[PDB]
Amino acid sequence: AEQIMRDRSELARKGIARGRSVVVLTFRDGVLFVAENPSTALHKVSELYDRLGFAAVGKYNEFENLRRAGIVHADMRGYSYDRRDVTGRSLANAYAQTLGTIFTEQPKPYEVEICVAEVGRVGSPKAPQLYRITYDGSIVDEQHFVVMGGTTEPIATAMRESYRADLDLEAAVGIAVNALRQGGVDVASLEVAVLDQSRPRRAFRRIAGTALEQLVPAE
């Protein structure tokens, strides 16, 4: 009684584990989101802001909230100051703080794992940045790639040994879609999108169907 945190903790871990997985990566255009998503309608990755992307895993409703919440917290800053000041680090901490609280206070912790990605402005030589936040309020500054959901071990290493900078898009899709197969099957029945540093404003587009074909490698 006190190490209830041990318990709660497990509850989330287990809930996250027993579910589909996601991989986010750093490449040439900017940042790629590839996550198993059978759903035709409900997403798992979303534009968070001008140069900000978001993708989670766990119970939908729970990260759905955290998603809207972000969308709001961003908009707020942008309006309050200047879109130019909305950052990733900002929505990172924010999520950290929120989840951290939820964990400690809410009746049931949030079975969620979140990834916030920001792809540099529309010019400067700054390399994308990745952020992962755990159900209990933990963040880590990943500069290469990030994986969450289901069983990470296989997919994780399958990448540790499979990652390359300046990775072409078509190729970064492979690297990931492969590792993904290495832990669980891999039809063009998922949702992918990307934060394109080329774009001048939006910077976030989703790779539809007809054009995803020509990216994902077969068995």
Binding site: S46, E47, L48, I71, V72, D75, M76, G78, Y79
Partner: protein, 242 residues
């Protein structure tokens, strides 16, 4: 929590809802492709000219924009907020708002200012856009006008305008304007009435070839809205002159 950025302020940060630098004239025209806005750029507090390069028309989103006339300060913040009200609803709902939505929202935002309105600091906008949900993409361009008490009104006459020189411009167009036309003919008729409004109104003062002051414009179509260039306007107002 209804996908309204505004409504979020309503409940979590309410502090965001001629003593100071006035308005000007703004015109709206309908046409074959879509619709457009063109507005003067002279801000006048009193009889004194305060600025001659102020942009009065802004692109609200991909397929719409609006020009606001009235207290510059109150009108700026109001459109910006409208913009965000729109963009946020998309990011959240995933799709964008109907055009009739964007309008009803803008109307709410106006209704909100009525307080300040009845104290002199009023503002009124003009909203235009390519209705992606209109049946006949021929007449897909639209114009919405407003009250001070927050009424929403449909153009249904291809053109409209708001501002001090509006009565003028409206009349010029009642003559120099004809339905289905080029996005070159309408951008022409706009700079025109925007010229006549300046003739009979010291508050406006359209195209000034001597100074380099040219009307600001914006055209929305099936491709979206884009801000006309400073070249397509000057070499366009020169043509208008005689």
């Amino acid at each position: 929590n209804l996908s309204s950025f505004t409504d979020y302020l309503r409940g979590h940060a309410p502090e965001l809802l001629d003593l100071a630098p006035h308005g000007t004239t703004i015109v709206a025209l309908t046409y074959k492709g879509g619709v457009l806005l063109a507005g003067d750029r002279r801000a006048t507090q009193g009889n004194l000219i305060a600025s001659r390069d102020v942009e009065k028309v802004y692109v609200t989103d991909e397929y719409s924009a609006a020009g606001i006339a009235g207290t510059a300060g109150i009108a700026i913040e109001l459109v910006r907020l409208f913009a965000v009200e729109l963009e946020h609803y998309e990011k959240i709902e995933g799709v964008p708002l109907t055009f009739d939505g964007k309008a009803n929202r803008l109307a709410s935002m106006v209704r909100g200012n009525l307080g300040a309105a009845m104290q002199g600091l009023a503002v009124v906008p003009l909203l235009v856009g390519y209705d992606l949900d209109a049946d006949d993409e021929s007449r897909a361009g639209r114009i919405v006008s407003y009250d001070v008490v927050g009424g929403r009104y449909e153009e249904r006459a291809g053109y409209h305008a708001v501002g001090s020189g509006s009565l003028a411009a409206k009349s010029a167009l009642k003559k120099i304007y004809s339905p289905d036309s080029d996005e070159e003919t309408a951008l022409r008729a706009a700079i025109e009435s925007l010229y006549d409004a300046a003739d009979d109104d010291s508050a406006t003062g359209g195209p000034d070839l001597t100074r380099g002051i040219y009307p600001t414009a914006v055209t929305i179509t099936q491709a979206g809205a884009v801000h006309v260039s400073e070249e397509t306007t000057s070499e366009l107002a020169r043509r208008i002159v005689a």
